[PDB]
């Protein structure tokens, strides 16, 4: 997702926070 989530939430579509990195399909893309 190329997105970090230091405050606990991801905003990129389909991405979820695995503090402190956003993941999609289980990977930080």
Q: Which residues pair with 21 in a beta bridge?
A: 4, 18
How many structural domains is the chain composed of?
Answer: 1
Give CA–CA dist 6/29, Å, rounded: 16
Q: How many helices and strands (H and E) does the chain possess?
A: 0, 2
Peptide bond into 20 cis (omega under 30): yes
Residue 19 token pair: 């503090």
- Measured in degrees and rounded to the nearest 5, phi and psi for residue 11 equal -115, -10
Experimental method: X-ray
Residue 17's beta-bridge partner residues?
Answer: 22
Resolution given for this structure, in angstroms: 1.8
Task: Supply the range of the domain harboring residue 7.
Answer: 1-29
């Amino acid at each position: 997702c190329g997105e970090t989530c230091t405050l606990g939430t991801c905003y990129t579509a389909g991405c979820s926070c695995s503090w402190p990195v956003c993941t999609r399909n289980g990977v930080p893309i």
